[PDB]
């Protein structure tokens, strides 16, 4: 049993409505649920739905703002009417065969609502070659990457060796640190490491590239600022081996 | 509803046993467990009623009185570092009954490598000018601390697995544009061990 | 199959015709309750059982599972519909006939498949709608059904009653007559 | 007569020796044909028809469903039976006995619960073995029953015929006699 959620990452202005789709992929969802998780809190049930109708919302949360359309035995979409910075949360949906005991959770959608998108900026990726002292002593070379100055932290870091993605000897921080925790609109910073053999790095034919996928304001998102548009881009840094 | 430990920190290849406490459990209630990774949806591990359950991921233990339950993981791997949620209930009105599944705080588990031969050292890596300090090959008992200065940035310790030689090692990165900042003073307020290399 | 007491928790039904659906709970043959999918409420056919509560939401979702399951089986069986069987009709009183005292007439319709029937009470060419009640389609070991229709009445010398049963398993409608004798 | 496709789910519970023997059997039917079933004695979904096979293989593939269905013996059958012990298994209705005549003699035993009854015919303190015809136990629906026991005979002056009826609600059998 596998459940998918689209979009994965979402950024919008205050007033914009966001459609989060919940889909059943290798089964037919008898009952589909909706959950809401805040920064450092547990999961909270919003509503329960069945084809065709209708939603069974829980408590303290209006249905004027949250709209669920469980039509189809695999589809159920949630709409957030007139988005407010309070709504900026992690949204996860469930699917069963059916009921809460049989439920299987989706990947989750990270929502971010802003008054204006002037705070959004893409990361500045920088890759650092390992010191000769490290290679001489440990007989291993650690390629350190650094992503700096990005808002929000809606980013995916990946290591690539000779045009192919590598997952062995890779380390990345689970949480990016704030560069200015004193300010509410503080830019984030994330670093990653890649370890390879001393003989593997000292070879010049091998190519090492740190790749950072950024998700930002795209399609219909007004940009009047003098600086470049911070659209969903892939900022990357690379360095070749040396003896 | 339920009470389970706040957090646990264990070494690789050790049996981890999280205990859920539910004295007020109803006759027709399920013991369900979820594994949440940051930041994604929770993974359904195991579920049971009155009898002992066995999964490819873990194993559930339920005694006769049903006052408590224990989730036992076989050999914890570095990948098992997650939040483990314990839930009691019949699934609510849609199953149907009074007892609806509500998410508790959950046990924050963290798994650590076991380093039989540590080699603590701070290395300076330069770009392909700006440089960064690397505190690596240190034991899992050695802990890093955040910086006091706003211009100095220090990252939390993380473990990298190299399955090519079954080699594992801890690592920490630090950087600052402030004059003057050196790698000999970078991890001094952590505090680093006495057997550390500084070139 | 051999047991002192047997119960169905519950008797789930869904058919393409209508489409119609039925949810019941039975013990030792007789019906305990039925859930109305329309008004979304549980109705108990016994007063001593009214003390308990059964949320209708389960029947509502379970019938939606049988909606998909029936639609799944039509594709699998290359469209194979139910075989219209012969319904057995019998009309009798609940208690011994007393001209003064009241009585309840019972029109038992057995061997019903598919569960689509029209039970009508007739009295001197006129149809009777006052003092009528019908039990829900009750399950059988041969996976068919039986339905009971009641009629509260005070017997009389010139008053005669009939039970018209309309089914797809009949060439002509069945009518069973009753007289107080 | 239009085409009708019927699907049934009978999640049945069986009981013997009070609470000592409980057997859960849940079966799925299409149309009047039982395609798949789940017996508590086997502990797995087993197909009856080729139409049952794709569901049974899929439901036995998922380990989570197995644990919930194995629990249903206690979660459904054993739990609900405790409620029955206080209501339905406590229901007792005394029957009404009436003999109507002559060559024919019928004993009309009306309105009683539970279904267990033992009605006998006697010809002057002597139990009649042959010449007795009984209609099947009639379910009235409204949690009451009735049984019509007829007895063929020959008339003689001074001969009394008795209808002996045994029921759990009755502390002693009813002595209803018909004089000739």
């Amino acid at each position: 049993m596998v459940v998918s959620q689209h979009p994965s990452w979402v950024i919008c202005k205050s007033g914009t409505s966001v459609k989060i789709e919940c889909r059943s992929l290798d089964f037919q969802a008898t009952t589909m649920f909706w959950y809401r998780q805040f920064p450092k809190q547990s999961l909270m049930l919003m509503a329960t739905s069945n084809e065709g109708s209708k939603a069974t919302y829980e408590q303290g949360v209006e249905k004027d703002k949250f709209l669920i359309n469980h039509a189809s035995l695999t589809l159920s979409t949630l709409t957030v009417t007139s988005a407010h910075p309070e709504d900026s949360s992690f949204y996860i949906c469930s699917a069963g065969v059916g009921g809460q005991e049989t439920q299987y959770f989706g990947p989750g959608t990270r929502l971010l609502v802003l008054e204006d998108l002037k705070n959004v900026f893409p990361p500045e990726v920088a890759v650092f070659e390992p010191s000769e002292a490290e290679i001489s002593h440990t007989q291993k070379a650690t390629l350190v990457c650094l992503a700096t100055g990005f808002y929000p932290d809606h980013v995916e870091l990946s290591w690539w060796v000779n045009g192919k993605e590598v997952h062995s000897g890779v380390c990345t921080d689970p949480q990016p640190l704030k560069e200015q925790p004193a300010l509410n609109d503080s830019r984030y910073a994330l670093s990653s490491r890649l370890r390879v053999s001393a003989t593997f790095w000292q070879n010049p034919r091998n190519h090492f590239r740190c790749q950072v996928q950024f998700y930002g304001l795209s399609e219909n998102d007004e940009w009047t600022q003098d600086r470049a548009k911070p659209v969903t881009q892939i900022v990357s840094a690379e360095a070749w081996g040396r003896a | 509803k339920t009470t389970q430990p706040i957090s646990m920190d264990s070494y690789e290849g050790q049996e981890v046993n999280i205990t859920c406490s539910h004295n007020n459990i109803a006759t027709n209630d399920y013991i369900t467990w979820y594994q949440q990774f940051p930041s994604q949806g929770p993974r359904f591990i195991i579920q049971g009623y009155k009898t002992k359950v066995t999964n490819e991921v873990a194993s559930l233990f339920i005694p006769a009185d049903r006052k408590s339950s224990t989730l036992s993981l076989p050999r914890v791997s570095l990948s098992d570092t997650a939040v483990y949620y314990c839930l009691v209930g019949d699934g609510g009105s849609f199953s149907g009954g009074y007892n609806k599944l509500i998410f508790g705080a959950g046990t924050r588990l963290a798994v650590h490598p076991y380093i039989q031969n540590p080699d603590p050292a701070v290395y300076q890596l330069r770009d392909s000018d700006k440089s960064v300090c690397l505190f690596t090959d240190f034991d899992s008992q050695t802990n890093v601390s955040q910086s006091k200065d706003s211009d100095v940035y220090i990252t939390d310790k993380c473990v990298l697995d190299m399955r090519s030689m079954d080699f594992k090692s801890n690592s920490a990165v630090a950087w600052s544009n402030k004059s003057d900042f050196a790698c000999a003073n970078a991890f001094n307020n952590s505090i680093i061990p006495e057997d550390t290399f500084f070139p | 199959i051999v047991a002192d007491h047997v119960a169905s928790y519950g008797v789930n039904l869904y058919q393409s015709y209508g489409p119609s659906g039925q949810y019941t709970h039975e013990f030792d043959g007789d019906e305990q309750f039925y859930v109305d999918l329309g008004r979304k409420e549980t109705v108990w056919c016994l007063p001593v059982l009214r003390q308990f509560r059964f949320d209708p939401q389960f029947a509502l979702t379970n019938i939606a599972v049988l909606k998909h399951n029936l639609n799944s089986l039509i594709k699998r069986s290359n469209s194979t519909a139910a075989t219209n069987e012969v319904p057995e009709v019998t009309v009798f009183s609940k208690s011994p006939v007393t001209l003064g005292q009241p009585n309840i007439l019972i029109c038992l319709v057995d061997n019903i498949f598919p569960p689509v029937v029209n039970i009508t009470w007739l009295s001197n060419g006129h149809s009777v709608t006052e003092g009528v009640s019908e039990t829900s389609f009750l399950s059988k070991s041969d996976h068919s059904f039986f339905k009971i229709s009641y009629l509260t009445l005070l017997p009389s010398a010139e008053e005669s009653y009939d039970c018209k049963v309309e089914h797809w398993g009949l060439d002509k409608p069945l009518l069973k007559h009753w007289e107080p004798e | 007569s239009p085409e009708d496709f019927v699907y049934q789910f009978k999640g049945m519970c069986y009981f013997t020796n009070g609470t000592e023997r409980v057997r859960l059997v849940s079966r799925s039917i299409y149309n009047r044909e039982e395609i798949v079933r789940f017996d508590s004695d086997v502990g797995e979904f087993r197909a009856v028809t080729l139409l049952g096979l794709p569901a049974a293989e899929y439901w036995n593939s998922q380990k989570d469903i197995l644990e919930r269905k194995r629990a249903a013996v206690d979660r459904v059958c054993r739990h609900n039976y405790q409620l029955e012990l206080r209501t339905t298994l406590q229901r007792r209705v005394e029957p009404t006995v009436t003999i109507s005549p002559h060559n024919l003699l019928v004993c009309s035993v009306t309105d009683f619960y539970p279904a267990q009854i033992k009605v006998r015919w006697f010809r002057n303190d002597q139990e009649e073995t042959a010449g007795v015809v009984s209609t099947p136990l009639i379910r009235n629906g409204d949690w009451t029953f009735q049984i019509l026991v007829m007895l063929e005979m020959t008339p003689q002056r001074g001969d009394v015929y008795t209808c002996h009826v045994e029921h759990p609600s009755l502390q002693s059998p009813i002595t209803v006699e018909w004089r000739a």
């Binding site: 089964f27 065969v97 | - | 928790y9 789930n12 389960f58 599972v65 998909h68 | 799925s28 794709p54 249903a72």
Partner: peptide, 11 residues
């Protein structure tokens, strides 16, 4: 409350 048993979906 009387506890029922649900029917599973067909693939």
């Amino acid at each position: 409350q009387p506890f029922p048993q649900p029917e599973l979906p067909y693939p």
